[PDB]
């Protein structure tokens, strides 16, 4: 499995539709309003703001606090590497009662279930979950209630080194001497070992 935030966001979006979809608004296709941040298509088209309440998913960054390389192994003749990653994600609810919805979303991510569905879709484990503020932003006319939350994930990624190769034959030479630097060696041992 390779690590790609584009897939983690999609998996989280698909999971949230079932986990917390009953509290959200629904579009013309009856689907709950969960979307990825900064919507756009065809390199210039821009999405419209859905009907409230809705959810936004945005991946912040990715780091490797756990060393630099976790494993190096051979799976088939191609060499492989494994690396441990950490990915903080930001989920926000916009509308009225955003805090009341974020609280229930928090209380469900900690269940034994749900954490299995997340791993089934994204193949990642939930590591931490931060606090929830209760924000108000003026916009125009009326304030909008919002409630962000940060959910950190952990995943292992594997890549293939197509430039690598393996050793399958070894040739060894040796000598024996009574004294250091004895120019004609007392004995010479030549060895050759094949994998087969």
């Amino acid at each position: 499995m390779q690590l790609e935030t584009a897939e983690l966001e999609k998996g989280l979006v698909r999971t949230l539709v079932d986990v917390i979809g009953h509290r959200l608004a629904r579009d013309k296709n009856n689907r709950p309003n969960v979307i990825r941040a900064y919507p756009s298509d065809n390199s210039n088209d821009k999405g419209l703001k859905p009907d409230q309440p809705f959810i936004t998913v945005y991946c912040q960054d990715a780091a490797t606090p756990y060393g630099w390389v976790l494993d190096k192994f051979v799976e088939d003749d191609v060499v492989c590497y494994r690396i441990a990653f950490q990915i903080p994600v930001l989920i926000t609810v916009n509308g009225k009662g955003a805090h009341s919805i974020m609280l229930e979303l928090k209380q469900r991510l900690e269940m034994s279930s749900v954490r299995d569905l997340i791993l089934e879709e994204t193949g990642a484990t939930v590591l931490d979950t931060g606090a929830i503020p209760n924000d108000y932003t003026y916009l125009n006319t009326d304030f909008e209630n919002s409630a962000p939350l940060v959910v950190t994930l952990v995943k292992n990624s594997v890549l293939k080194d197509e430039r690598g190769s393996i050793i399958e034959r070894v040739i060894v030479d040796g000598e024996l001497v009574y004294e250091e630097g004895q120019e004609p060696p007392e004995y010479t041992i030549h060895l050759d070992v094949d994998s087969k």
């Binding site: 441990a84 900690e110 954490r115 484990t125 952990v154």
Partner: protein
């Protein structure tokens, strides 16, 4: 799989334990080293393989965690039993990521927790002993 603190499960005496402290809620340690080398005056080395294999298991819980009542009740029962009956039970720890592959063969409660009542909720530390702290492996 990869490590996450929400998957660790500890079971002792048939009950389950939850309400772990936010950090450093479990510790394991052997009592003695595997080998004690001895060096003579001439630089020769000989090895002694210690037969000691006991260990200690420290687990921290929140002050209001329900597991505190269960352990206190279990300890109270054992104070009113004759020496013929036993008190040891296997301490089993499960972790899907394989970070902690160990288990206490015959584990007995050893020390009661210290209590502090500062500003915010504090933690309680329970210490168990074991006859053999086994370190298992997932590879043949």
């Amino acid at each position: 799989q990869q490590y996450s603190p929400k998957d660790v499960v500890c079971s002792w005496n048939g009950i389950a334990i939850e309400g772990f402290a936010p950090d450093s809620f479990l510790r394991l340690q052997r009592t003695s080293p595997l080998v004690t080398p001895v060096v003579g005056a001439g630089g020769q080395v000989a090895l002694t393989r210690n037969a000691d294999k006991t260990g200690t298991i420290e687990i921290e819980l929140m002050q209001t965690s329900l597991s505190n009542q269960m352990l206190s009740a279990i300890q109270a029962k054992q104070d009113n039993m004759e020496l013929e009956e036993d008190i040891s039970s296997n301490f089993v720890i499960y972790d899907p990521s394989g970070s902690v592959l160990a288990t206490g063969i015959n584990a007995w409660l050893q020390e009661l927790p210290q209590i502090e009542l500062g500003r915010d909720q504090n933690s309680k530390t329970w210490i168990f002993g074991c006859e053999k702290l086994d370190y298992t492996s997932t590879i043949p």
